């Protein structure tokens, strides 16, 4: 039941988008450089 990826801390989008891509029922993830939230 991966729904936090807490162990993903200090990791990288690689393993993130990778595994995160499913775990739950295909729960994906938005890869962004922090920045603001679209104006």
């Amino acid at each position: 039941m991966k729904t936090e990826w807490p162990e993903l801390v200090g990791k990288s989008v690689e393993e993130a988008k990778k595994v995160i891509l499913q775990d739950k029922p295909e729960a994906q993830i938005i890869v962004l450089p922090v920045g603001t939230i679209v104006t």
Partner: peptide
Amino acid sequence: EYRIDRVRLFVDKLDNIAQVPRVG
């Protein structure tokens, strides 16, 4: 909400997941 398939995965300078995603 529901099982949205997206999570604000913010990255650092060298892509260092400094923020943990959850989707829950």
